[PDB]
From Swiss-Prot, chain A:
N6-acetyllysine, modified sites: K46
Role noted for this protein: With S4 and S5 plays an important role in translational accuracy.
Keywords: Acetylation, Antibiotic resistance, Methylation, Ribonucleoprotein, Ribosomal protein, RNA-binding, rRNA-binding, tRNA-binding
Any further remark recorded for this protein: At least 19 substitutions or deletions in 11 codons can promote streptomycin resistance, dependence or pseudodependence; all but one of the streptomycin resistant mutations (K42R) are associated with hyperaccurate translation and thus reduced translational efficiency. The streptomycin sensitive allele is dominant to resistant alleles.
Residue list for modification 3-methylthioaspartic acid: D27
Gene Ontology cellular component list: cytoplasm; cytosol; cytosolic small ribosomal subunit; ribosome
Presence of keyword tRNA-binding: yes
Part of the full-length chain shown: 63 to 124 of 124
Protein name, as recorded: Small ribosomal subunit protein uS12
GO MF annotation: an example: structural constituent of ribosome
Family named by the database record: Belongs to the universal ribosomal protein uS12 family.
UniProtKB/Swiss-Prot annotation, chain B:
Gene: arfA
Highest classification ranks of the organism: Bacteria, Pseudomonadati, Pseudomonadota, Gammaproteobacteria, Enterobacterales
Effect of gene knockout: Cells lacking this gene are viable, but those lacking both arfA and ssrA are non-viable.
Organism: Escherichia coli (strain K12)
Feature: compositional bias, Basic residues: 33-46
Complex formation: Interacts with the 50S ribosomal subunit. Interacts with RF2/PrfB on the ribosome. Contacts ribosomal protein S12 (rpsL).
Protein name: Alternative ribosome-rescue factor A
Top-level division of the source organism's lineage: Bacteria
Annotated region (Disordered), positions in chain: 30-46
Keyword Hydrolase assigned: no
Phenotype for K36A: No change in kcat for peptidyl-transferase by RF2
Residue numbers of the full-length protein present here: 1 to 46 of 72
Example of a GO biological process term: rescue of stalled ribosome
GO molecular function, one term: rRNA binding
Misc remark: Active protein is only produced when SsrA(tmRNA)-SmpB-mediated trans translation is limited. ArfA can be synthesized from truncated mRNA, via ribonuclease 3 and the SsrA tagging system. In the presence of SsrA, the stalled ribosome is rescued and the incomplete nascent ArfA is tagged for degradation. In the absence of SsrA, truncated ArfA chains are released from the ribosome and are functional.
Curated annotation (Swiss-Prot), chain C:
Gene: prfB
Miscellaneous: The gene for this protein contains a UGA in-frame termination codon after Leu-22; a naturally occurring frameshift enables complete translation of RF-2. This provides a mechanism for the protein to regulate its own production.
Lineage: Bacteria, Pseudomonadati, Pseudomonadota, Gammaproteobacteria, Enterobacterales
Keywords: Cytoplasm, Methylation, Protein biosynthesis
Cross-referenced Pfam families: PCRF, RF-1
Localisation per UniProt entry: Cytoplasm
Name this polypeptide is given: Peptide chain release factor RF2
Function: Peptide chain release factor 2 directs the termination of translation in response to the peptide chain termination codons UGA and UAA. Acts as a peptidyl-tRNA hydrolase. In the presence of truncated mRNA in the 70S ribosome, ArfA and RF2 interact such that the GGQ peptide hydrolysis motif of RF2 rises into the peptidyl-transferase center (PTC) and releases the ribosome. Recruited by ArfA to rescue stalled ribosomes in the absence of a normal stop codon. A TnaC-stalled ribosome binds RF2, but the active GGQ motif is prevented from engaging with the PTC by TnaC.
Gene Ontology biological process terms, A to Z: translational termination; viral translational frameshifting
TM regions (residue ranges): none
Length: 62, 46, 362
RNA sequence: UACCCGCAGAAGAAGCACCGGCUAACUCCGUGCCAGCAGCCGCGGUAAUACGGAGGGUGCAAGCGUUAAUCGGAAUUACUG
RNA sequence: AAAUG
RNA sequence: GCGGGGUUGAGCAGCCUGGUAGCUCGUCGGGCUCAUAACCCGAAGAUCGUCGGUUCAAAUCCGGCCCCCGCAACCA
């Protein structure tokens, strides 16, 4: 399949084990699946403060 | 930094030129706010 | 001395710019470590390494040393400027001026070295301009770009020559190739290779919308067409033998057929068209020659293709400049220099962008 | 063990999503068809309640979101209809 | 008589 | 080996008995049109492959060289 990668910036490259979840990106011809940010080799998004759970980002402790 | 997957197949003569005749460097024309392609059925907040 | 003062003021700035582009501190550090390594006696046991290290060092040293000199010379000039002005000693003033000139020259040399390091950078070039996907607007943009380039070249001193031009049926030009002769023409222009992005309200649109059209420039140097040297008799292996079928006793006996073979490449050419062995050989030889040429061409193609592929890998980064004429700002995307005098730039004031690019090494 | 009695001291104990319309909840800054968002419709091309941050708010709460899956809405296989 | 945007 | 060829940017003439560079397209400048095409008007453009020769004089006649196109390159 082909899978979208949401969030700004990603660490993925060839031979990078990832989890996909389903959900199509409308504008892209043929993409029916999103990667899960924060599962397996895929990193969480850097410096996200809102909707963090969607982008696999942990709560910044202060 | 991810690679752009161009629609040209195997580029032979010149890369830049090929790119130029590609969707990535397609023309973009803006929608008119007033004038010709200007009518909006519903507002941005309508 | 007003001009002199101005020059002095400029020179420091120039030096600073050079330093910035060079990444001077890093270079210095490299020189240091390398120097240390050289000083250590164990490095020269491995010969290949040592020579390489030496090679690395010297250039770095030169770069640093020159920079250092630039710092000092200017200061000296400044010091002597006062003398020239107030004390009114003429000879001293003259000396200072001379020093400045020398220093300036030195600076130029370093900057020249930095800029025009490539092999073909001295040669003349073919600027190739190709319009984008838009239609009329794109063509117009391309034409404008071409005009700008022409203006630039003339200003520089270069001899322009419109080799080929495809015109747009309504307005502007569809494509154009321009031979640009002069010393260091390729090295000056090579940076302009890339996609150029116009943004403006289209005059050809009936709606009058804002259009964002692209157009490619592509600068390549005039390489000397190296002659196709003939192959050696030692490189070839030549069989001769009987032919297939035919008719007679004579034919059965004689070895007219000829099979030439390249030992390096493993290519072969047979011939048995003629009765005469010699003729066949000649034909066969010709064929072989042709084949070699074709192989050389194939090789050339393949290499080129690799390069093309590599270039493609940059993708959206092939876009080097952004001419926004609605908001009136030109920006070079790779270097980051901006100017609000769009019109001026169009007319052919690319030195500001070009020079910076050269300095960068991009 | 459940359960009861005594001890001390606010003490050890709140997050998650969302806020263009549908849909409860709006502003400023950053970016400038990019980066990104998106369930649908769409947003973003320099004043973005739609992107990202912040403040403010709304809804759920030891959970809250996303994905998958089924029926519903779908009278969109209509026996009822 | 009269193609196209 | 025997013929035919190389002429404005393209395709063709003339060379036919040496002295006159023509046709159609294309190019350039005007027009018509909102614009482009078509259409209309007006221009430009050729060391005749190359090098020698014969001539008062050569695209034209003769030869050499380079390139093209036919053909023929057989009886075992
Ligand atoms: Mg919403
Ligand atoms: Mg509401
Ligand atoms: Mg959101
Ligand atoms: Mg804003
Ligand atoms: Mg938001
Ligand atoms: Mg039903
Ligand atoms: Mg012809
Ligand atoms: Mg006559
Ligand atoms: Mg004549
Ligand atoms: Mg016309």
């Amino acid at each position: 399949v082909t899978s979208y990668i949401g969030g700004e910036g990603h660490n993925l490259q060839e031979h990078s084990v990832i989890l996909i979840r389903g959900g199509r990106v409308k504008d892209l011809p043929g993409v029916r699946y999103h990667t899960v940010r924060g599962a397996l080799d895929c990193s969480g998004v850097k410096d996200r403060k809102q909707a963090r759970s969607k982008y696999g980002v942990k709560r910044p402790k202060a | 930094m991810s690679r752009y997957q161009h629609t040209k197949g195997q580029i032979k003569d010149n890369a830049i030129e090929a790119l130029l005749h590609d969707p990535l460097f397609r023309q973009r024309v803006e929608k008119n706010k007033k004038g010709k392609g200007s009518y909006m059925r519903k507002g941005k907040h309508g | 001395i007003n001009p002199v003062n101005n020059r002095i003021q400029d020179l420091t700035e120039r030096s600073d710019v050079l330093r910035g582009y060079l990444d001077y501190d890093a270079k210095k550090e490299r020189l240091e470590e390398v120097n240390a390594e050289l000083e250590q006696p164990d490095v020269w046991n491995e010969p290949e390494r040592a020579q390489a290290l030496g090679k690395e060092r010297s250039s770095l040293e030169a770069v640093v040393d020159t920079l250092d000199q630039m710092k000092q010379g200017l200061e000296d000039v400044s010091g002597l400027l006062e003398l020239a002005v107030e004390a009114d000693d003429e000879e001293t003033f003259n000396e200072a001026v001379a020093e400045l000139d020398a220093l300036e020259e030195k600076l130029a040399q370093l900057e020249f070295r930095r800029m025009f390091s490539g092999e073909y950078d001295s040669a003349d070039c073919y600027l190739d301009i190709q319009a984008g996907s838009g239609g009329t607007e794109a063509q117009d943009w391309a034409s404008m770009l071409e005009r700008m380039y022409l203006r630039w070249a003339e200003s520089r001193g270069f001899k322009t020559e419109i080799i080929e031009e495809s015109e747009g049926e309504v307005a502007g030009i569809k494509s154009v190739t321009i031979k640009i002769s002069g010393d260091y023409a390729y090295g000056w222009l090579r940076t302009e290779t890339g996609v150029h992005r116009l943004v403006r309200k289209s005059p050809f649109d009936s709606g009058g919308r804002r259009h964002t059209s692209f157009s490619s420039a592509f600068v390549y140097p005039e390489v000397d067409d190296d002659i196709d040297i003939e192959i050696n008799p030692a490189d070839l292996r030549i069989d001769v033998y009987r032919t297939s079928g035919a008719g007679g006793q004579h034919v059965n006996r004689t070895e007219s057929a000829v099979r030439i073979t390249h030992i390096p490449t493993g290519i072969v050419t047979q011939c048995q068209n003629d009765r005469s062995q010699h003729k066949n050989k000649d034909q066969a030889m010709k064929q072989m020659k042709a084949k070699l040429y074709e192989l050389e061409m194939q090789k050339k193609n393949a290499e080129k293709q690799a390069m093309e592929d590599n270039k493609s890998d940059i993708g959206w980064g092939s876009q080097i400049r952004s001419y926004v004429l609605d908001d009136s700002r030109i920006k070079d995307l790779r270097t980051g220099v901006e100017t609000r005098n769009t019109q001026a730039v169009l007319d052919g004031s690319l030195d500001q962008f070009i020079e910076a690019s050269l300095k960068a090494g991009l």
